[PDB]
Symmetry: C2
Subunit: 138 residues, 2 copies
Amino acid sequence: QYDFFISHASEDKDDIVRDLAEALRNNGFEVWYDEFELKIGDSLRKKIDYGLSNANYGIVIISPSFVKKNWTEYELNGMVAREMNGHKVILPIWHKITKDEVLRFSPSLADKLALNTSIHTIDDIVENLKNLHHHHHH
Amino acid sequence: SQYDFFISHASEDKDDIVRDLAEALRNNGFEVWYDEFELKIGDSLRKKIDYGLSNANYGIVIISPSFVKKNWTEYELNGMVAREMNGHKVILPIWHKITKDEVLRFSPSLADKLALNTSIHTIDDIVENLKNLHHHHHH
């Protein structure tokens, strides 16, 4: 049982996904991601289910490559609503995306709490995820 | 011949955000100039801005990865963002599909400078901001 998995479209794997995983590991956390890549066809709920069974939290990278998979509102609302051990466990991070793109392809996400790599450095993101982990697992 | 806005940009952004923002501003009654403001390595940011302001009220600059990876110097970027005309700041940066880490790596002086951001602001939000600004100074 580990700390975070990172679900992502393939286009984000070698850049923000790898960099975020590295930074979390350098902060004592166990983080995996490769098998949580989402390809056209893959089931978002199944991927999240596999991840949350092994890890405390799922990070989901909300990039254009992600939202253009045309997930349904239910798929997306269920994702952000997931709870485990008595708290929210899915952490969306907007990445190289416009609000207009979110509203076009994934409008249910437009209002849901998320980090945003245009506003938050990797260090800022790590500090936020640390604080959450500390508040829940100690 | 006068325009309300000119839009400076890297070529990578021309057919996407630049065209979309220009179209929305134009639909909302503004005159927008952007065909002469593609930026490339070796261009003088100061001379390009001088030229845009010679026939436009405001310059918009698209702060995307393609823009910042042209490696502008701090003096060039500080001079751009601080540019005033008729007693007020006239260069309007808009961050677009960029990370804060990329800004700190390639253009760190921009990290603390006031800007719109297309991950936070829809094109309609941007147009509303620019409409209110332009009206205040040019009605």
